[PDB]
Each structure stands twice: as C-alpha cells, then as structure tokens.
Amino acid sequence: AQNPNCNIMIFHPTKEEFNDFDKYIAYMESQGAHRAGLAKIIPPKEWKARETYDNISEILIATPLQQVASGRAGVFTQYHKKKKAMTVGEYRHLANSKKYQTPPHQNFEDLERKYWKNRIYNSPIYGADISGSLFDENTKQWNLGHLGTIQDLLEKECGVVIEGVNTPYLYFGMWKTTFAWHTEDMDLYSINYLHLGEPKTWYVVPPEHGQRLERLARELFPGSSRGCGAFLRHKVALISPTVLKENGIPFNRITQEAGEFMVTFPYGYHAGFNHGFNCAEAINFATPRWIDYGKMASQCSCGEARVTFSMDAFVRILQPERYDLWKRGQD
Ligand SMILES: O=C(O)CNC(=O)C(=O)O
Ligand SMILES: [Mg+2]
Ligand code: NI
Ligand SMILES: [Zn+2]
DSSP: OOSTTOOOEEEOOOTTTTSOHHHHHHHHHHTTGGGGSEEEEOOOTTOOSOSOSTTOTTOEESSOEEEEEEEETTEEEEEEEEOOOEEHHHHHHHHTSTTTSOOOOSSHHHHHHHHHHHGGGOOOEEEEEEEOOOSOTTOOSSOTTSSOOHHHHHHHHHOOOOOOOOOOEEEEEOTTOEEEEEOOGGGOEEEEEEEEESOEEEEEEOGGGHHHHHHHHHHHSHHHHHHOTTGGGGOOEEEOHHHHHHTTOOOEEEEEOTTOEEEEOTTOEEEEEESSSEEEEEEEEOOTTHHHHHHHOOOOOSSSSOOOTTHHHHHHHHOHHHHHHHHHHHO
C-alpha cells in the first residue's frame, strides 16, 4: 500500500506531464497521495497562470465577510458578518493597514504560533467565494476554468445526464482569515491555486480517519452536534493542532506559497489560514474514484449549509433516499 503513514506528498510534474490533468491526478493517487487528504503540486518552471497581476484591483468584492470568533483560542466557531462592498484595491489597502497587517515574525512556525494564540481576538475580513477566474484564456495546462465538469464525469461514469454547471471561485485573504474544518460538497475533490501574495497554511485529516475528527467535533461543539447530524457542513468550527494532538487525531500540515496548487481529495477534512494579503482560485472536480464517496457523503438537512444549484442533481441521482429530506433543508 503506497503512503501508508498518509503523509502530504509534493509533486513536481514536468511540462509534458502537465498536459493531461486527469492522468496526473491518477498518477498522484497511484503513489498514495490521496491517503493524506491533500497534496501540493509545484508547476513546471515553463508554466504561468497569466502574464501579470498588475491589473486586478478593479475586481469587486460585493460582500466582504468579517469573521468573528467565539470560544477559546484552540476551540472556536466563527460567524460571518457581511460588510459593504469594496474593490480588490480597497481590500488590499485594508489588509496592509496597521489594524489588519501581518505582525512581525521570524518564520512560518512563529506566525503559526501567533495565529493560534491570537486569532480569536481579532475579526479579519475575507473576500470569499467570488465567481470568476484569473487564469489567462491562453493558459492551456491546469487552467481551473477549463476543467472537465462534474456533470460530465457523472454522465460518463453512470450514463445519466443532469443539469448544473461547475465554475471557479476567487478568494481574497488577509492575515488571520480562516477556513473552518470541512470536506467539500458531496465529498468532491478541490483544487486551489494561490495566484499571488502571502502564503496559506493548511491542516488536513486523512480520509480514512475523518470520522475521528467528526467524533471529536461532536464532543467539542455539543449544542451544534444536537442541532445537526452533519454540522461540519456549516463550515464554522475550528480546532487547533494542539487540541487535535491532545485528542489523538491524525493530521498533517503544510504551507502553500504563491504559484503553487493544492488538491484536496474526497472526504479529506481541511482547515487553515492566510498569512497576509493574497488571492486564490479554487474549484471542485470529480474523478471515477469520487463516485463512491459521493454516494456516501453526509448531508446537512437542518437548513444551515445552503449550497449551489448543482448539488441538487448530485443528491437526486447518488442519494435518492436522502433527497426529499435534504431538499426540505434547501427550501
Ligand atoms: O482558500 C480557502 O479559503 C478555502 N479553500 C478550500 O477549502 C479549498 O480549496 O478546498
Ligand atoms: Mg481589475
Ligand atoms: Ni475546501
Ligand atoms: Zn446543518
């Protein structure tokens, strides 16, 4: 069995190997990369996402989100307070202001310490989930707006033809902006490219041990657990590495830098934070190996998780017994 310790693997494809996306995902899985829940892919030196970023300040962040925490430093939830619209140029200046900027630090480890000590005491503002792309249309390799669609994958594997679309999303971050512990919708893969700026630190639980994280989360967030049998779908709960280690939860960590891709694998729980002003692009995707994970994915029916249009068909086809209850939670 490849990668039996479930370590995060780092890949360096050549320009030739970067042509065929599906083939390279399958290669990484042949080497056991999925067992970690997360992999890093460093593009060949010949590749570029686009020519320059010199012209992005006019993108609008229609609904910036202030991430307000409650709890203790290592075990907290966050809620998103909506803020007035602002441009990427305005948001960058805000991220760099004395109130929000990255503090002085020695290295990524010191910064990680400072994040887990102090996160709860601040409310950083995140531009998340913005439909769009920063890949040049002429970038042919690993262009996250040109991937094979999940609808097409389901049609190819299972024969069924469904409505829905699959487009990328932009994320503009600042120091302490936080992504809560989650798996993807329908336990899909994700791919995330850090276009520019400061790093992103990731934490991940191997898929084979995801239920260990769920059981700890039920213990740590007991009211939330009574409210919903899949409350991690709400994407609000944070648990620190120290707390994970105290409770014996297997996990790994890695820091993504500008120019790098990360892939999350089906049912790989992940969480993390941004180091400073940055911009990422991410999209969900599927492969044949996903289908069994999609059939078994948990679902939130309490009403909180509210998701895209395209998840309807995935539930309806892969999980027809759950469909009626889940759709009630959507409506
Ligand atoms: O970058 C972020 O804020 C969160 N991204 C992801 O959870 C992802 O790419 O799957
Ligand atoms: Mg612009
Ligand atoms: Ni994710
Ligand atoms: Zn719920």
